[PDB]
Amino acid sequence: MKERIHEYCHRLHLPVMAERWSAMAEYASTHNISYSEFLFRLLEAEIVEKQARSIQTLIKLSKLPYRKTIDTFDFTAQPSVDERRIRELLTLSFIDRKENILFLGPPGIGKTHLAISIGMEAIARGYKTYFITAHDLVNQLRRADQEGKLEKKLRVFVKPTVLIIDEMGYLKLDPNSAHYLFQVIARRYEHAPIILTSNKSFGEWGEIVGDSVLATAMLDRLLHHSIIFNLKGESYRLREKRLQEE
DNA sequence: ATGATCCGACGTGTTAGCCACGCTGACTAGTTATGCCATGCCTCCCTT
DNA sequence: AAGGGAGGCATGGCATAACTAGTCAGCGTGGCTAACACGTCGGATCAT
Ligand SMILES: Nc1ncnc2c1ncn2[C@@H]1O[C@H](COP(=O)(O)OP(=O)(O)OP(=O)(O)O)[C@@H](O)[C@H]1O
Ligand SMILES: [Mg+2]
C-alpha cells in the first residue's frame, strides 16, 4: 500500500510530499495529531517548497547577473541617498502607483545594487520581474524585428511587472534602433514600473539615442510617474580597492 | 523536450437589410448544318 | 488461317443558307453581408 501511496504522490506531481512521507507518518504516529491539521501541515510545507522553487525559476528566467538585496547595502558609505526613500520603495507602492524608479550618479555608487535589490524584493512578493541592460534590450528588439517577430519580443519586454534597465548611457545606442527602446517606454507607460539606472543626465539622453525629439518624448513618458534619486559619493569599487590595498 | 492546462482570439450561427446576380425578351451577328464532290481508308472476299 | 486485292462507303473540304447563340436591357428574387452572441479551437506557458 505504501508503494501505491508513493506512486500516487509522484503522479499528482508531489515529489517533496513523497520524499517526506515516511517522516510525516512517523511524526503523526508518535504524536497524536488530527488528520485535518496533519494535512494542513503537509500542504503548507509543499506550498513553501513550491514557492521557493518558483522564486528560483523566476530568478533564472529574469537575467539578473548577481543576486543582492537591500540588507547588504551600506547607507553609511553612501549618505547621498536617504534610506527612508529606499525603504518606501521596498514597499512596492510604486507598482500600484505605476511609478518608475530612476537611479543616477557616478559609476559604482550602488545604482545597480539598489536596482537588483528592488527587483529581488518584487520577485519575492510574487511580482513578475525582468532584468536587462539597455544595449542588450535594443539589440534583442532589433534582431527580433529583423526576423519579423517584433511583437513577440515586445510582449516579452512588456509582460513583466517590473522591468529593470541597467547601464543606460555607458554605450551609445544605434540611432536606427533607439525607437525600439521608446516602444517599451511607450507601452509600459502607465501600465508597469520601470527601474532604470544610468550615469548620464537627462539632458544628455539625446546624445545617447542620437535623436533629441525621441529622447525628449522618452523622458516625458518615463518621468511622468517616477521617483528620481541623484546618488553621489566615491565609487564603491575604488573604496574596496583602497581597503584591500590598505 | 513533451504534455497538460489555462487563457485569449477567432469562427460560427442567427437575423435583418440591402445590393448584385439571374432570368427573360428582343435584336443582331456569327457559327453551324447541309449538299455536293472528291479522295482515302476500311471492310469484305478470295486465294494460298 | 493469314495476306493481298478490290470494291464500297464514309469523311473532309468548300459554298451557301438558315437557325441559334450572344449580348443588352429591365425587372424580380435570392444570396451575401453585417452585427451580435456564444462556443470551440489554437496558442502560449509552466511543470516533469
Ligand atoms: N553601498 C554598497 N553596499 C554594498 N555593496 C555595494 C555598495 N555600493 C556598491 N556595492 C557593490 O559594488 C559593486 C558595484 O556597485 P553597483 O554595480 O551596484 O554600482 P553602479 O553605480 O550601478 O555601477 P556602474 O555604473 O559602474 O555599473 C557591486 O558589487 C555592488 O554590489
Ligand atoms: Mg552599476
Swiss-Prot record:
Q: Which UniProt keywords apply?
A: ATP-binding, Nucleotide-binding, Transposable element
Q: Which SMART domains has this protein been placed in?
A: AAA
Asked if the Swiss-Prot or TrEMBL record annotates the protein with the keyword DNA-binding, the reply is no
Please name the GO terms of the biological process aspect recorded for this protein, alphabetically. DNA replication
In which residues is ATP bound? Answer: G105, P106, P107, G108, I109, G110, K111, T112
Which GO molecular-function terms appear in the entry? Answer: ATP binding; ATP hydrolysis activity
Q: Does the keyword ATP-binding apply?
A: yes
Q: Name the coiled-coil region(s).
A: none
Give the family from UniProt: Belongs to the IS21/IS1162 putative ATP-binding protein family.
Name of this chain's protein: Insertion sequence IS5376 putative ATP-binding protein
Question: Which source organism?
Answer: Geobacillus stearothermophilus
